[PDB]
Design a binder for this molecule. Structure first.
Ligand SMILES: N[C@@H](CCC(=O)N[C@@H](CS)C(=O)NCC(=O)O)C(=O)O
Ligand SMILES: N[C@@H](CCC(=O)N[C@@H](CS)C(=O)NCC(=O)O)C(=O)O
Lengths: 199, 196
């Protein structure tokens, strides 16, 4: 198939798809958009947002849906419906968490924003990350089913983005950091990290 | 297995799971939580929220994940991974739409303003696209055939209609999809026995 990814010129929600396509070892166009050109491109997307992955000429959006699809293609999904449920539930929970990051990112009042960041760093992150940490510990060192999934790749690629703001944030969570080191050293993901544009 | 669904005593995000369990034709305990008891129950849930579906005692959360799981068990998912992507992408987009709703649900004059953006901007942006998608793709959200996404979509829209009675009336293909789904025998039977 042909693959063309459109996203902004940073990691964000494009990166899970880039990592999955790299893991899949397929060529793909990495179409990156500057923030300056976004009001132009916005009206061209199916629902006004990126990422968009064009597969054999058909535009598909939603980072999670696409990651799962590529995960199936990659052999990084479940062996049965229950195993896929174990992956899906963790990523939907992660996406509930990262909604908090989005609220903080889009706040225009600086003092409120500082208040969101405080709540985020001292209540929200511990609440979710202690559970994620305990879950990974008790699930074989992975998000789900004791084995590598597209969920692990989605989780780590997006957490890496957080490390660009709060650099130490995942360090104290031993099992999150252990999954992080494992994923970024998958050879094709490692390669992508080495060759990817480094803003 | 045994199934126990815990959610509040209204439709909301529990209703897609109730509809899917009904469509699956399996017995389940419909554990409907009153707001008064929610502070007690909240700490017992995996991540502080409902719905929670207990499957032979194991707690699973996340309404979309559960609906997809039950969808696959019910023969209402895709025939291949492309077809499953077609369902999954529409529902994640619908969940983006829903996210705008959730903020309203969370001062009665600032509520009145959030509600004007929802009805006047957010709803028309999304529902025009959903309506035309359904129109030009066989009368369903994905792949020209009934999926768990249709169930999820219509059940949550039905709950939105209990607040904004005319919200889908101008979207004739959405309304038509609604009418198809709620007249499915297993669904219809649920709608008749559920709390008023
Ligand atoms: N649920 C969507 C969220 C996509 C999304 O939020 N895209 C943002 C960038 S991360 C965007 O397009 N912002 C530009 C805008 O909203 O105009 C997904 O997971 O792909
Ligand atoms: N992504 C979750 C969202 C769950 C959610 O937002 N649950 C709300 C009710 S619809 C809740 O439990 N509110 C009570 C609380 O947060 O204390 C899902 O789809 O199940």
């Amino acid at each position: 198939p042909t693959y063309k990814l459109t996203y902004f010129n940073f990691a964000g929600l494009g990166e899970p798809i880039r990592w999955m396509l790299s893991y899949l070892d397929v060529p793909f166009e990495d179409n990156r958009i500057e923030r300056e050109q976004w009001p132009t491109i916005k009206s061209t997307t199916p629902y006004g947002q990126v990422p968009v992955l064009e597969v054999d000429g058909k535009q598909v959006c939603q980072s999670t849906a696409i990651a799962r699809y590529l995960g199936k293609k990659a052999g990084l999904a479940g062996s049965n419906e229950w195993e896929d449920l174990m992956i899906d539930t963790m990523i939907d929970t992660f996406n509930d968490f990262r909604s908090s990051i989005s609220k903080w990112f889009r706040e225009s009042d600086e003092a409120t924003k500082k208040k969101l960041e405080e709540t985020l760093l001292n209540e929200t992150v511990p609440f979710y990350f202690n559970k994620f940490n305990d879950h990974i510990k008790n699930n074989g060192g992975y998000l789900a089913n004791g084995k590598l999934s597209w969920g692990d790749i989605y989780f780590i690629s997006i957490l890496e983005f957080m490390t660009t703001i709060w650099s130490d944030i995942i360090d104290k969570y031993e099992h999150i950091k252990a999954l992080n080191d494992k994923v970024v050293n998958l050879p094709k993901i490692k390669a992508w990290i080495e060759k990817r544009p480094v803003p």
